[PDB]
Every structure is written in C-alpha cells, then in structure tokens.
Amino acid sequence: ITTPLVHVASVEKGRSYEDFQKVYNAIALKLREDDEYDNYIGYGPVLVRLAWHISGTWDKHDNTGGSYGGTYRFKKEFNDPSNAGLQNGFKFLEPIHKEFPWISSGDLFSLGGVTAVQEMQGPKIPWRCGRVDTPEDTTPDNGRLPDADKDAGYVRTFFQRLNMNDREVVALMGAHALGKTHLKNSGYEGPWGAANNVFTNEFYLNLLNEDWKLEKNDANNEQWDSKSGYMMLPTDYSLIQDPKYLSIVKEYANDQDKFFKDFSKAFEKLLENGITFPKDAPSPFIFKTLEEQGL
Ligand code: HEM
Numbered sequence: 001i002t003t004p005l006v007h008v009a010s011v012e013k014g015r016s017y018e019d020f021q022k023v024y025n026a027i028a029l030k031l032r033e034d035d036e037y038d039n040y041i042g043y044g045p046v047l048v049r050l051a052w053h054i055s056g057t058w059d060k061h062d063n064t065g066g067s068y069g070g071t072y073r074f075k076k077e078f079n080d081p082s083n084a085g086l087q088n089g090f091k092f093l094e095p096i097h098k099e100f101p102w103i104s105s106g107d108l109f110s111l112g113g114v115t116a117v118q119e120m121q122g123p124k125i126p127w128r129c130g131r132v133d134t135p136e137d138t139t140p141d142n143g144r145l146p147d148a149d150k151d152a153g154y155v156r157t158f159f160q161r162l163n164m165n166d167r168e169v170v171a172l173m174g175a176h177a178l179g180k181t182h183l184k185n186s187g188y189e190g191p192w193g194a195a196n197n198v199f200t201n202e203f204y205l206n207l208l209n210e211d212w213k214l215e216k217n218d219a220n221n222e223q224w225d226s227k228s229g230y231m232m233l234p235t236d237y238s239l240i241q242d243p244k245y246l247s248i249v250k251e252y253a254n255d256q257d258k259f260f261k262d263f264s265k266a267f268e269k270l271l272e273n274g275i276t277f278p279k280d281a282p283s284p285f286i287f288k289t290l291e292e293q294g295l
Helices: 017-033 044-053 087-099 105-119 152-160 166-177 202-209 234-241 243-253 256-271
Strands: 213-216 222-225
Touching: 017 044, 017 087, 017 105, 044 087, 044 105, 044 166, 044 256, 087 105, 105 256, 152 166, 152 234, 166 202, 166 234, 166 243, 166 256, 202 234, 202 243, 222 234, 234 243, 243 256
Parallel strands: none
Antiparallel strands: 213 222
C-alpha cells in the first residue's frame, strides 16, 4: 500500500509562452514599482523565499508536498511558523493573480521567484507550466521546512529528502545574498551581505573573507556575526565547517558564472520536484527580462 503519487502537469487551457510572459512582466513591472518594501530592499528576496518554501515541503519517499498543488493558499501551510513573513510575498502576487485568473497558484508562486531572480540581475531560470491546484486535504503538515540552528550533517540529510546533492545544496544556499533575516519572523536579525537586492555570489565571498564570531541575538538564538554588520545562520556557517561543502563554497566565490549555472539548474529542479511532465508537454520557457524587452 501507499505508493508514490503521480502529479501530471497540465498546461492551462489555450495558454502558451506569450501568455506566461505577460504574467512575468506584470510581476516584474510591479517589482520596480513597489520599491519601498522592507527599507527599500524590494519584494525581490521575499518572492524567491516564497518559491523555495512552497517547494521545500516535498518528500521524495511518498511524493507528498511540493509546488504542484499550490497548497500555500490554505491556512495550514499559510500559517506554518516556518513561513513567517512570506505573507508579504503572497499579498504582492494577489493583484497579479486577479489580472491573470487562468494561471494556477503553484505556477504563480514559482514564477514569482523565477521573475525576482532574473529581474535582480540573476541567471536565466527555465520554467515549466502545468501545476494544478489540489484540494485543502492535500496540504502538507507543518515541520517539513528546515531549521536554521543546525549543522552540516542536518543540512545534508534534510536536502537528501529533496533529492539534492552537495553541489546543488551549496548553489541553492547562495540565494541568501538576497534580503535579510527579521527577528519577528525567524528569531534571527541581520543581512548576509551588502547588496540585498542584487543576485551575486556575495554569500560565498563573505563566508570566507569576514571574521565571524558566534554571538547571541535578542531572541536568545546564536548566530554568526561579523564586524561589517553581516550575519550567518548556523546552517550557513556549516557550509565552511564541512570540508566537502567548503570546496564548493570556495569554488562559487572564485567564479560567479559557475554559481549562476548551478543555481539555475538546482532552482528549477527544486521548483519541479514531484511533477511528472508528459511526452507532449511544452519545453521549458526562458522569459525575457524587462530590460531585454525595452519595457
Ligand atoms: C538549510 C537551508 C535553509 C535555511 C535553514 C534557511 C533559513 C532562512 C531563514 C531563517 C530566513 C529568515 C527569514 C526571515 O526572518 O524573514 C531565510 C531567509 C531567506 N531565505 Fe533561506 N534558508 C535555507 C535555504 C534557502 C534556499 C534554498 C533559498 C532559495 C532557493 C533561500 C532563500 C531565502 C531568501 C531570499 C531569504 C530572504 C527573505 C527576505 O529577505 O524576506 N533560503 N532563510
């Protein structure tokens, strides 16, 4: 009994690449519009974290969770303490979903992250459509998303459930160059770097160049802080405590074009975990940025 479920992607009725490019633009044009958010950081980082959390619930052993069903719209997943603060990213996409009611929740949640990465001068991320909304009883329970106070052994074993290897783990972790930690959300405070809304390899550079000291924040949690004002979660710092993670961290710090390649592969794999694309399914889309369109 209990065999892994199969989630077959179904492209929305009469929708092609041009339809989803208009959803990309509406997201991208609203990114440069609502620039005041979070001390002028912008909704860029919160949309990338939203796409990762709606996908990070996947369990490869029974094919439960994932980005397919768009179950973040339900109260159980919406009120997950691990998702504290993501409601800002949800509210950003609400007027966009009203303009495009044909697109599914799972497609819009994942496309929001893909748009935010590219519009913040990141790598191109191929994106496939076809996610189908599933009922509220398919919502995964709380507690599938990772804790921040753990070590590299936990990081490696957690991502094994998402079918990620060491190279994919370190690459996905480079997204922490975006945004900051908020004490009201996670019990951690501070940004990882200086360019909080530009997708670069600054995460790995600061991990190797700053003098990190383990300190205690106002929430009684311990986080690594440097004299420049940056911070690293214990799971961030485990990437240089582990010798196999460290070699990859030093690699991305010395080559951003390489980090862009491995992030684009791992981030798309994360957003597509648990989805079965049939033989007649369309090819992954590479959306043009607003700059490339003159818009
Ligand atoms: C072991 C893995 C990870 C842990 C423990 C972790 C933990 C955290 C925590 C605690 C925050 C603080 C959020 C807040 O206080 O508002 C955060 C923020 C963030 N995370 Fe992660 N994360 C992990 C992996 C990832 C991945 C895989 C991605 C993207 C692919 C990602 C993207 C982000 C972004 C962009 C933010 C900034 C949010 C904002 O500024 O609003 N993280 N992370």
